[PDB]
Design a binder for this molecule. Structure first.
Ligand SMILES: O=C([O-])C(=O)[O-]
Ligand SMILES: O=C([O-])C(=O)[O-]
Ligand SMILES: [Fe+3]
Length: 314
């Protein structure tokens, strides 16, 4: 009695919760870590692939699995009643498991209590904004959502305004935004909330905690909700243990599993009423963009092309 989880997530983030599932259910969980090329591996393994559940990060990566024919549709009242409609595919094709909101890091004492994404292009922020490469998936997803909401013309004008406002070249990573706010290079920047979970939970006497202490989170909205990307999962097209695969996926959205799952990378659980990490809770109420996240995949290439058009990374 077994189930195979193919995951692009390091099993370290999920081993305790998988062990609980196995203990309680009696179903052996086989964890297969696939660092990259998940689609390609499952395709190559063909009709007899051992894969039961496919787990990955980024809505585009998840939709690529579905469009690549390596998933199957499932019916589950458990999953559909837990996962909001905008965060799951039609007829059980894929499901979000956690939310990765892209927020504004803000110098801790700056007078700024709210923000719209569009505000980042205000001329007053010139020389005051940090951001990583505009071509990084975290950013192209946000740009894709902006096209969906506001159109290509408005999105291009935002990109040009933000580029004009950068304090340094769009490069590095998300936590570099916090470093550079601490360093007085910029006052605000776009980066993922979960990194602030990591930094603020780091122990005093680390550089991570020094960066965390330097900043606060303000969650911008579109107007209006905050942009989220996701981690998520789907049942594999040829799952040899389909009943167990559905059991595992249903378990992954249960309250106990969600509590552990989100805490692991300081992400936000998909299931309502799940206890948050204390740092994450301190960010205040989250309003999730009502946009179907599948729209992010729809507009991704257009978004990437706009980023290139404006020479965002120059
Ligand atoms: O994306 C990043 O910046 C990271 O994971 O460190
Ligand atoms: O895992 C991550 O967050 C990355 O590689 O950026
Ligand atoms: Fe990252």
């Amino acid at each position: 009695d077994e189930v195979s989880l193919y995951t692009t997530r390091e099993p370290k983030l999920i081993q305790p919760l998988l062990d609980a599932f196995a203990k309680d259910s009696g179903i052996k969980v086989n964890t297969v870590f696939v660092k990259d090329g998940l689609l390609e591996r499952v395709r190559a393994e063909g009709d007899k692939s051992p894969a039961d559940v496919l787990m990955t990060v980024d809505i585009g990566n998840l939709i690529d699995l579905v469009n690549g024919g390596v998933t199957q549709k499932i019916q589950s009242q458990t999953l559909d009643s837990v996962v909001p409609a905008n965060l799951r595919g039609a007829e059980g094709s894929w499901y979000a498991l956690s939310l990765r909101d892209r927020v504004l890091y803000v110098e801790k004492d700056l007078k700024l209590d709210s923000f719209r994404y569009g505000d980042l292009a205000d001329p007053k922020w010139k020389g005051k904004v940090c951001i990583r490469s505009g071509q990084h998936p975290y950013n192209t997803a946000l740009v894709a959502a902006m096209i969906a909401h506001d159109g290509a013309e408005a999105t291009e004008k935002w990109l040009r305004g933000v580029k004009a406002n950068l304090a340094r070249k769009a490069a590095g990573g998300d936590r570099d935004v916090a470093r550079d706010i601490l360093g007085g290079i910029c006052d605000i920047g776009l980066a993922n909330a979960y990194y602030v979970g990591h930094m603020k939970n780091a122990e005093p006497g680390t550089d991570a905690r020094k960066w965390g202490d330097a900043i606060k989170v303000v969650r911008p909205t579109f107007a209006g909700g905050t942009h989220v990307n996701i981690s998520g999962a789907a049942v594999a097209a040829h799952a040899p243990n389909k009943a167990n695969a559905v059991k595992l996926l249903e378990y992954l959205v249960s309250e106990p599993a969600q509590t552990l799952y989100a805490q692991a990378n300081y992400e936000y659980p998909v299931r309502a009423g799940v206890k948050l990490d204390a740092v994450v809770a301190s960010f205040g109420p989250l309003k999730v963009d009502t946009l179907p996240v599948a729209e992010i995949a729809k507009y991704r290439k257009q978004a990437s092309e706009l980023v290139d058009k404006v020479g965002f990374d120059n």
